[PDB]
Ligand binder design. Structure first.
Ligand SMILES: NC(=O)c1ccc[n+]([C@@H]2O[C@H](COP(=O)([O-])OP(=O)(O)OC[C@H]3O[C@@H](n4cnc5c(N)ncnc54)[C@H](O)[C@@H]3O)[C@@H](O)[C@H]2O)c1
Ligand SMILES: NC(=O)c1ccc[n+]([C@@H]2O[C@H](COP(=O)([O-])OP(=O)(O)OC[C@H]3O[C@@H](n4cnc5c(N)ncnc54)[C@H](O)[C@@H]3O)[C@@H](O)[C@H]2O)c1
Ligand SMILES: [Cl-]
Ligand SMILES: [Cl-]
Ligand SMILES: [Mg+2]
Lengths: 353, 361
């Protein structure tokens, strides 16, 4: 049985929800939140569980092997759930964190875990797991879609941005260390997340803000850019379930079983926010502002997560409309959190507390 | 627009030296800059034949050191890069465990970053909108068929085969492929990627599989065969690879990927038996003389794998085909080996590493 589990990037958006899921569901396991607290981390995300007996925070940078080694020595971790990553494109910082950072963690897992030479080359035992490297990644490793089709676990990688190339690289390292050294691993690739603790500059929170403040809602081209949207709480639940139930070495796609054009997303937020505030039907549609089309905005990103449901029974707990309702409710209930991010005060949390 | 300066990274290496030579001979009007850090893998003796050519220049530079690369870009304002520099000795030293990522991934990014800064990229060419016009710039990325994983009894690697790298090395190479394509898509950087089979031929280091088998046959040392020797590779003659790179560089549509193979697939046992046959015949030995050296040993995991390219696309698009069968390429390789025991001795003694200090001082 596992006694210590590291969650990297646990101060972030998705990571805080995963930290919460593991802490709540596993009181007999120490959950180590390992995080460098970049601009993207927000320890205010975990104010509710920060005084739990099985939660511990460690400020550390996965590009610094010496700092990671100190955490590995301190806790002797049985497993890593790896969410730490950089999306801002020191022009190679994102490669340092996403690729070298993943290798640094893998090297320490290879060093601290006792790997069996008999399990290399896909020969993972059906026996229960003692260790696991759980790698969280993005559906952008698969590239983009035309009008038909979906991302499957068998879809050829075709990352189209520097960020998604660096994430695709980290996926490859995990799988190659699994094959070459017998390191137990899982990889999951998920669609765009949304929900509580999303930073206010992100798409959905920004649209909520622009609607409440009667600011224009820019629509590029015809707004036909299309994404599957996954509720962050559903994502964290899937990671936990897969971590516990999936066969070693599997890949699962995780998504919300939908696909939405941006114009329809904006129109749904307008619909819910006008009704929420008792405004007339269609009140905020005058905010929609059609602008020029971005090159490649005519792209489609739609994950197929049917393998995950077929194997483990996981399914989303909300439709996108229901998830937006909870997201709007959370937004309107957390004026302070939102303002602490916008003001930059959120970063003083580690020093102040 | 006629290019004037082309960088070949890793041009002191095995494949890179042959690529330098092909570009030097075929393009007398273009300056070919051999950019190489001279690791243990590099050997400037490889280029002794062309080191005084008027369109050849050597620049000792490390692609993991942006300041050294920037100096080369400032000096030559290069129009193109043919990128072969790479590191494959994973676990070489605990003093540098991620050297393979630093060279293969970060080093590729460092080169991509300078191309993005020095080249004029048209924002209308992003998202795969490259024009059907002669290129002014090209990032030609050389990679490995191992990005595709391995094969069962049937099937071949295609350009459309999903990446499945199975080693830290091939994962780092796959990562570099992704960076090249993403810079192409995101910034409109002209690029080509090719992934090739195992290379063999002149200037191959003596510990590599085919040179070691030649040495062991010549010196009546055992030839270990793992399991049944059914490990199978497509084998590409190194000079055919360099010729393909040069042709693709000039004729392929911007943004294309090609797999380059030798139009064959050989089991290790058949490769060893072919070397035995040719070496025995070349040195006047009775047929079967060296077969007693074959030594069957315990099979090891991953030694029954199969790696083979279907190069239909390259053959259809450009008309390219190998200049030799594997048997003919082995004959040329044996001939070169026997004519170059000086080169081989200089590698084994370590003296090859003193060439730069001895000739460029
Ligand atoms: N829509 C999405 O957000 C989305 C979609 C698909 C996949 N993913 C993946 O999910 C993971 C989490 O994404 P997110 O949106 O929650 O990220 P985020 O930006 O909200 O949080 C990342 C966290 O990692 C930390 N971090 C950054 N660099 C670090 C380093 N060098 N060392 C240690 N910690 C470091 C940051 O401080 C932050 O707390 C990432 O791996 C991302 O690729 C996210
Ligand atoms: N069978 C094969 O050799 C084979 C097969 C498939 C693909 N490839 C690819 O072909 C390319 C060349 O392979 P090779 O066998 O000729 O390699 P090699 O090991 O013979 O040569 C590599 C060269 O790169 C140089 N180099 C290494 N690190 C460097 C750095 N940081 N900065 C600058 N120069 C550096 C070395 O000094 C050397 O001259 C590689 O990209 C490899 O992935 C090779
Ligand atoms: Cl839009
Ligand atoms: Cl063998
Ligand atoms: Mg299905």
């Amino acid at each position: 049985h596992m006694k210590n589990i590291i969650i990297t990037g646990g101060a972030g958006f998705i990571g805080s929800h995963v930290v919460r899921e593991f802490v709540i569901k596993n009181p007999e396991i120490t959950i180590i939140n390992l995080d460098a607290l970049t601009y993207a981390g927000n320890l205010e995300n975990l104010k509710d569980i920060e005084n739990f007996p099985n939660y511990v925070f460690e400020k550390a940078d996965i590009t610094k092997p010496e700092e990671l080694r100190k955490v590995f020595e301190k806790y002797n971790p049985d497993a890593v759930v790896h969410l730490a990553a950089e999306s801002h494109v020191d022009p190679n910082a994102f490669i340092n964190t996403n690729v070298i950072g993943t290798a640094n963690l893998l090297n320490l897992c290879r060093e601290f875990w006792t790997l069996n030479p008999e399990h290399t080359h896909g020969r993972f035992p059906n026996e229960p797991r003692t260790n696991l490297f759980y790698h969280v990644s993005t559906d952008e490793v698969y590239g983009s879609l035309g009008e038909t089709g979906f991302f499957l676990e068998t879809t050829a990688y075709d990352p189209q941005s520097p960020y998604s190339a660096s994430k695709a690289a980290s996926d490859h390292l995990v799988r190659a260390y699994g094959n070459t050294y017998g390191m137990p691993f899982i990889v999951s690739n998920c669609s765009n997340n949304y929900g509580p603790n999303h930073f206010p500059e992100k798409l959905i929170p920004l649209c909520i803000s622009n609607i409440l403040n009667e600011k224009p809602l820019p629509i590029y081209g015809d707004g036909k850019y299309t994404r599957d949207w996954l509720y962050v709480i559903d994502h964290a639940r899937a990671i936990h379930q897969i971590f516990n139930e999936a066969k070693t070495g599997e890949t699962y796609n995780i998504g919300g079983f939908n696909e939405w054009q941006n114009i329809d997303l904006v129109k749904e937020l307008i619909k819910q926010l006008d009704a929420k505030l008792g405004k007339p039907e269609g009140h905020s549609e005058k905010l929609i502002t059609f602008v020029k089309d971005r090159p490649g905005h005519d792209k489609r990103y739609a994950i197929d997560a049917t393998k995950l449901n077929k194997d483990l029974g996981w399914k989303p707990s909300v439709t996108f409309e229901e998830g937006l309702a909870k997201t709007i409710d959370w937004y309107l209930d957390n004026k302070e959190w939102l303002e602490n991010v916008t003001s930059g005060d959120y970063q003083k949390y580690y020093e102040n507390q």
